[PDB]
């Protein structure tokens, strides 16, 4: 399918269409303002992925453990029996907590890499 | 602290707040022009980091040696007894020289990587 075709699919299946939605994210004064705001939004998301240490990746694994309080569902339950819309609602209240942890994790990684590189 | 809280701190301590200022870099016709110019500036800095081979990193080590003519201070003197404002003034006259060297270093690295990959 095309843009948002996987919206009703399970979380697992929809991960194979991540590039389709990505391509459609970027694709008289009020109209120009709208284009400028769309650009700023896109850049804010790219900057956020940069800060976390993901950069140009659509799937990015991290070192932040799952708290289990954010969601206590089984791994197969989440990936096989839920859509992304349901998941986004389910953990909306913890989004900023997760983002904060991701930023801190990358900062420690960068310092450790620098110190590892400093060894002769 | 928050945005620019580390401005008066030593160079070492301020490196732990690099993400805070980064987040605040992106955050009627004249106002729209101002937003467009802010976007162009941001992209120019990101392109420059890309050319140097750093991409999505806040701390990036390189292969360009320090000339010692640009600054002859001790490593601990620079990192423990100076702020970033003082440092920026101290080496302002050598900024373009350093940038040129960084670009050349990455170009050689890219060719060497390509030739290393070409080996069967």
């Amino acid at each position, epitope marked *: 399918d095309g843009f948002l075709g996987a919206a009703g699919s399970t979380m697992g299946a929809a991960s194979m269409t991540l590039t389709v939605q990505a391509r459609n994210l970027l694709s008289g004064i009020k109209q120009l303002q709208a284009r400028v705001l769309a650009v700023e939004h896109y850049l804010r998301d790219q900057q956020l992925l940069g800060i976390w240490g993901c950069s140009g990746k659509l799937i990015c694994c991290t070192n932040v453990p799952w708290n289990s309080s954010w969601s206590n569902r089984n791994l197969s339950e989440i990936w096989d029996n839920m859509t992304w819309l349901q998941w986004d609602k389910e953990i909306s209240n913890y989004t900023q907590i997760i983002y904060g942890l991701l930023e801190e994790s990358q900062n*420690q990684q960068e310092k450790n890499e620098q*110190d590892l590189l400093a060894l002769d | 602290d928050g945005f620019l809280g580390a401005a008066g701190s030593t160079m070492g301590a301020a490196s732990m707040t690099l993400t805070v200022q980064a987040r605040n870099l992106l955050s009627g016709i004249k106002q729209l022009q101002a937003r467009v110019l802010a976007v162009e500036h941001y992209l120019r800095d990101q392109q420059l980091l890309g050319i140097w081979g750093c991409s999505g990193k806040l701390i990036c080590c390189t292969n360009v040696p320090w000339n010692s003519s640009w600054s002859n201070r001790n490593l601990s003197e620079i990192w423990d007894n100076m702020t970033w404002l003082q440092w920026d003034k101290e080496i302002s006259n050598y900024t373009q020289i350093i940038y040129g060297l960084l670009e050349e270093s990455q170009n050689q690295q890219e060719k060497n990587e390509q030739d290393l990959l070409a080996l069967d």
Partner: antibody
Amino acid sequence: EVQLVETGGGLVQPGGSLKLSCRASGYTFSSFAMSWVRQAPGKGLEWVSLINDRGGLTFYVDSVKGRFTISRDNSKNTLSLQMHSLRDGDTAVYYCATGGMSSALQSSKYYFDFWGQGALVTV
Amino acid sequence: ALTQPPSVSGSPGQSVTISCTGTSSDIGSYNYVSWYQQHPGKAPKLMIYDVTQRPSGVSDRFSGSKSGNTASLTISGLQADDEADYYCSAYAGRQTFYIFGGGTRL
């Protein structure tokens, strides 16, 4: 002025475990890398383990890589080495020392700057 | 491990050299060959670091150098209280952090 005192256990049998902790004073603990060095009763010195100043990045000698854990608490000014298995060849006087590494923004060390008195671990 | 003479001695006041010999992957490649003095019953203390550097508080009679894969410590003006077990310690890179030599009984 600067002091390091090792505290730990005595006689351990093979297959057990023993935790050895070094207490530091007289300097900023969090500003220096720490390491452990051991001396067998009839031999010279050998390096055992190294931990950086933050404590997140550690290195070990291969002979103890799967047996010893090195950690530090910079708020408690405490360096701890938790040893497992403890073979007969591990009997030695263990010392904690300041030095052995520098976190990129500091001048190079690659030497052990300050040594404690040591504690004898007998298997 | 690094090779050191089992025993070194000389007359009081004489300049006595204790050598330490390694290989190209350690003493040769890296100019980080420290020296320690271990008095019997005491913990080692740092005497020399890097190649030619001396810690503050250390007498100027202790000095050294490096040539090829051989490092040496020279103690001028030998005193009765200088007889201790001396060790060399060389940086050997990231895979092997430090290598100590056998002790020399001065």
